[PDB]
Design a protein around this ligand. Structure first.
Ligand code: C28
Length: 217
């Protein structure tokens, strides 16, 4: 596998989003993963509707909108629904709304999704290199996470109990520290313009490889 990968270099990563006070991290993680696949299949980079997932991938999928959800069940909703609207057509309002999906605004589809084996960072590396960005959950409860500004994030107090959904868009090494390149959804003000480099091959740090999944078209 290549020593390093950065899907932003291949134009498969949309601009960083800001979820605000709505706990839609799972929705942003899911659309982020599908956006790359859409680019790989059609050649067009298009932001997909996280709001669409918040309002429509609800109870039947075990999700709670602005109060949390799963990336995998979001993917299944897209499969079942036979589509997902573009961000431009179904904008993000950071609130729970009635489902307003309309196929006339469909910007992507999904045929299946894959969940990687638990805590296997080399399997995650392979998927990021050969498939594309991967949705993951991390333990972002620690004060140090919110204050991350640069370098490679390593927190002694991190655990494998994940609570925040994000997107792995690459990996590599900085000044001897192997890392996973993570796209967050707390706006461009967070970390390095919306991104955070998290420790890689350090015992599944912060549970980054605990529950990885990616969609396909
Ligand atoms: C995001 N703003 C937020 N977290 C979540 O929604 C997480 C997503 S996760 O940590 O990536 N992960 C997905 C794979 O399973 C483990 C968790 N999910 C919540 C959640 C799930 C289902 C639900 F109905 C409500 C919340 C949790 F971490 F609790 F499992 C809201 C802060």
């Amino acid at each position: 596998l290549p020593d390093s990968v950065d899907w932003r270099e291949k134009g498969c990563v949309t601009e960083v989003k800001y979820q605000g006070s709505c706990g839609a991290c799972w929705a942003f993680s899911a659309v982020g993963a599908l956006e790359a696949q859409l680019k790989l299949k059609t050649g067009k980079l298009v932001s997909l509707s996280a709001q669409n997932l918040v309002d429509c991938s609800t109870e039947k999928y075990g999700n709670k909108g602005c109060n949390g959800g799963f990336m995998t069940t979001a993917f299944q909703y897209i499969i079942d629904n036979k589509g997902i609207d573009s961000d431009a057509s179904y904008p993000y309002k950071a609130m729970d709304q009635k489902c307003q999906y309309d196929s006339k605004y469909r910007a992507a589809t999904c045929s299946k999704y894959t969940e990687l084996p638990y805590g296997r960072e080399d399997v995650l590396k392979e998927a990021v290199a050969n498939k594309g960005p991967v949705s993951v959950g991390v333990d972002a409860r620690h004060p140090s996470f919110f204050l991350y500004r640069s370098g490679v994030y390593y927190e002694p107090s991190c655990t494998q109990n994940v609570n925040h959904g994000v997107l792995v868009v690459g990996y590599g090494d900085l000044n001897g520290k192997e890392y996973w390149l993570v796209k967050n959804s707390w706006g461009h003000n967070f970390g390095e313009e919306g991104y955070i480099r998290m420790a890689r091959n350090k015992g599944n740090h912060c549970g980054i490889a605990s529950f990885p999944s990616y969609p396909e078209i």
